[PDB]
Design a protein around this ligand. Sequence first.
Ligand code: UYI
Lengths: 282, 57, 240, 230, 340, 126
Amino acid sequence: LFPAPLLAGVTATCVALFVVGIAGNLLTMLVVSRFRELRTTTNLYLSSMAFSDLLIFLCMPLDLVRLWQYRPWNFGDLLCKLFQFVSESCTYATVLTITALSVERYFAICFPLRAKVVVTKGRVKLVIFVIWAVAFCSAGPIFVLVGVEHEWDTNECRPTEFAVRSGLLTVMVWVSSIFFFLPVFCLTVLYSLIGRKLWRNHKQTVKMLAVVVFAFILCWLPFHVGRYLFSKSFEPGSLEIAQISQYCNLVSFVLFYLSAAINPILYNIMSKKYRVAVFRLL
Amino acid sequence: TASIAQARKLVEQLKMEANIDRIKVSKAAADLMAYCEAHAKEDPLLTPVPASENPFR
Amino acid sequence: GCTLSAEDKAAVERSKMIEKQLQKDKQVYRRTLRLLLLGADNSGKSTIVKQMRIYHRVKTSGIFETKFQVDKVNFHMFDVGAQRDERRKWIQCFNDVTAIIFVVDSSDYNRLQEALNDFKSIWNNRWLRTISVILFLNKQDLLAEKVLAGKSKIEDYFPEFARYTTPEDATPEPGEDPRVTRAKYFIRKEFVDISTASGDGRHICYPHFTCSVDTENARRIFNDCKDIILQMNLREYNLV
Amino acid sequence: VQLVESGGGLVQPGGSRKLSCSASGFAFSSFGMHWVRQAPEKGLEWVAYISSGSGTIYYADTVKGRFTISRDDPKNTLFLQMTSLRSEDTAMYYCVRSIYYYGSSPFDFWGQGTTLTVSDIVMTQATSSVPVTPGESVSISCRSSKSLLHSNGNTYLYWFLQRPGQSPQLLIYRMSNLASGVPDRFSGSGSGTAFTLTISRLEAEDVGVYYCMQHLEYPLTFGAGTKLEL
Amino acid sequence: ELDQLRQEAEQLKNQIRDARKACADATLSQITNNIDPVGRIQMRTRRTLRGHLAKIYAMHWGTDSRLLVSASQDGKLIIWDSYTTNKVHAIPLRSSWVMTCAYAPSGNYVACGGLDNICSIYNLKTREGNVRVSRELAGHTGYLSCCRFLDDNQIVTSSGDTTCALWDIETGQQTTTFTGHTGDVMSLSLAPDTRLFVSGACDASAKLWDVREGMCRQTFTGHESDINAICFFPNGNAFATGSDDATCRLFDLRADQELMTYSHDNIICGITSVSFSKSGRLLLAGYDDFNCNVWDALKADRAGVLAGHDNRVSCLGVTDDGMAVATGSWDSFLKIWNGS
Amino acid sequence: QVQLQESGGGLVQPGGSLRLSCAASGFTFSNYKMNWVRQAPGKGLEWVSDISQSGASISYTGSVKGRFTISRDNAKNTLYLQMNSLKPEDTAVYYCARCPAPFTRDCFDVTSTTYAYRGQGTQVTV
Ligand SMILES: CN(C)N(C)C(=O)[C@@]1(Cc2ccccc2)CCCN(C(=O)[C@@H](Cc2c[nH]c3ccccc23)NC(=O)C(C)(C)N)C1
């Protein structure tokens, strides 16, 4: 659909993001595992996000092939379903872990002594397990929506025409939009409270929290607006909406892989313990 | 009058410690070297043992 | 497990039970906050621990410990007794306490420089770099009487007092003479200057003006420890 | 240290009984407990095992589905609930301590036992009766179907002495180590399959029946018993 | 009268120095110059013992080279099975601030002490199945630095106050007191024959004591700062020390002198622990830097480095058979090191 | 063998001057921070002055500030204290104290009753 040079440039930027994200996630996992002192409560969530982003990036080349070439899907139906299941589960786990980090930071800042009394790692691992279970159970209706569509000469991994006709598409759209509406509210409110507490010096902590929330909204709002436009693109009367839904989803694709690349920088750059650990690796 | 008592005690200690027969440093170093050489084969850290004999591997 | 005899399995089970008990001990160890109380013989920290005892033994006893609770938070204060003058060796055991409580008798200016040197040594120590200090400038009424009498002068021992003027922004207690405020602010400024001369990022000093009748020292310790824990949480949670 | 057993008596061949073992004088919660029964005019027979924590429970094959073992650490009581009691369940049941760590001495203290009347490695002790006189040397031997030596280097062979009218008393644990309170005249040795117990100078106190037990695997099995008599 | 006594002491010190210089005909490094180098000593962490909540100050090996004991400021003593990493015992202490550990040569008792000026002995092998405190020795007026068992009924302690004492455990009384030092005695090493022992205090000197006579025999005074560690050569005719200055030094009993120094320009931290190899050719020292350096005793060279811990190394010990080295540190972890 | 010997001292008229010296041996003078302490009769030891390893950082007590000057000569292994305009309150025994450990900013027990790295002192009378 899109002109060839545009897809070449998008592929170059995507592979650069792939390199950056793979390096960042590997470094984060190695640093957390190697050092017992850096095995803090927040580092468990950071490691879970690193694993989720690593799986998302390991799934990237099939996505680039799927947009880039429209090559026939000779890989099978089961792989077509499993690939998108893994991707969706990883995205849900990422956003849930972001929300969990926001909540933990709020509780540890506004109520320090009570947080140190109550917060324990044994509950943290349980929270991580519940997060992953919720991801695997909210991304589980993707074995019905997604299937290989023919017309073996031409094949693509695409949402199923029966799912589209029956109406599962809009329900899944709203279920996914919940995963945007809740994390944005939690991040915004809790980080505003943290900044208000710290603002009563401390300028960079608040500015960094505002960059983090702005990056979250910047990267995740187009993803769900593009999904809404895609779901609405299937109406036979929707002619003008096709080009916008196309370039909206391509931009959401690029910001989707931008999120997995920028998450380690946003959450690991100000530690001053991560930095010395990395320089200790040498 | 505690300072003079302490000084007397220190003088007595120095007097006792001065009367000691001392051997040469060459002989003492030779003795240390000989002990090190005679027990070299019994040192697991100096000469590591095979993994079949190591209780920690 | 495989290639383990029955006695080996029972020994492993006993070790696991020991680890369980160790975790139960670890939770309680993490709950409480440990403080080290320091001062001189004229500081009056004995009255401070006596009034902490409101919040609820061999002759050669090396350490005295008192416990108290503020808002369901357990504090453990350790007072050093029956030890020699040399502190360079046994002070390293308190390099992981939450805070150091330094008590100073501000009434007499003869030993104020000794207290300042003690504060310098505590602040600049290699193993006490991380620890914050809660500074109590005790015996405020005696200092007020000494500065109202006019017999004793602070410029004799601190010549820069004559050039000192109290800051325009200040919060004097009602009914307090300007001379008392100037003396108190200069005395606190000495310690604050020492504190801010180096290592301000890692640890913070918390100066207070207390007395023998004052009964709010427990709340002050609670608030300062809350701020210390807040700073530690900011450091740990990748916020800074 | 004291273990006192309660329960036992005339029971029908279909009834249910509960045995209790009250412990005092030692840290009960940190010891594993065993039940051992001895049929009238017969040898010992292991029954059940509950660990220091209640995680691990073992049973003999003959009582696996009917018996159950439990402990009440605050009360320092050990129980054994028995159901579907048969005529071969008539024996005297003992309460045995056992603590396991590097260098411990399991099976050291036995209870006085309570009698009940109802209306696998093979350990071989060839000898049954031996005539002795005080001031002599005697040797008691036993054999094992399976090699008792382990990769650890331990052998896991135990020797007990049951004097007439008393409970068994541990003599040697893990085939060579002498138990505390046991005279130095007793010595233990043997290969990985055949073992021997030596008494240097006999006394009137040494007269009794001697049993050998293996602790390599469960169930724990005993020997027939070699009886020394004057 | 004081001036005359000071002059006499100065004259005696001068003549002692002259006598020591007369015997210094050759250096240790000159004699061992043609000896072959040890090479490179590579060691790996075989086991890592976890379970302590706070920093570890002391550890000790059993006479069977399998069992350990360690102390932390949580107020806990843990006895480990080094072969299988099993915790055999866990002993809660009455005072959190514990500075030292000792394991009885028989293996029936364990002692400890610290900021409380008391040495507490615990009975490991009781008929009740628990570890209980057997005796509290309460004569010292300063913090307890080191403990060393002589028998099941005799123990030698060094304390923050300048004295050292020998105790009778059954009666709980000081049999002998050693009163030579002028600073905190920080370490203590028993001789193989257990007829003598050495100590290092917060002055720059070390003293050789006679256990039975209860008096000082020699003083060595070679370092520049506080001595933190001391250990005996396996022969029993020499010993080594570690001090706040970066150097470690080897002293000689028979020649009454100092044999060689173990220092490097890149080392500007203090030595916390000192131990020897079974053959005596390797000297292992822990540092304020989070590493441990292996030294060649005969020729002052750094054969290898132990770089596992991520905090200050506080304790160090070598088994009686020379099989392994255990290293404790302020990050609350113990590591067992072995060769290849 | 750590040794510290003080040289200057004597009877001084009020408004006079003195110069104290402290020849040090048994340690590397360059790596240690040096102090001056005094003990007036009927009082405890008081810290007087202080100087770092290179002389960059110098500190005085308020009682003697503006009159006393401390300096060191790392090549000659000696420590100096120039006492100008002496007062009758300055009659004490002056000691030359050594910091316990090298490469450190903090000195702990220089004014302790029994300190190992301190001199025998010199008498100054005004
Ligand atoms: C051209 N556009 C209009 N078309 C036809 C598309 O299919 C797209 C463009 C695109 C083609 C190829 C490569 C990259 C982007 C636009 C839409 C997105 N999308 C997807 O595949 C979805 C399917 C889906 C899963 N849960 C839902 C819930 C509600 C609606 C939809 C879905 N999955 C994913 O986004 C990930 C990366 C998580 N696996 C692809």
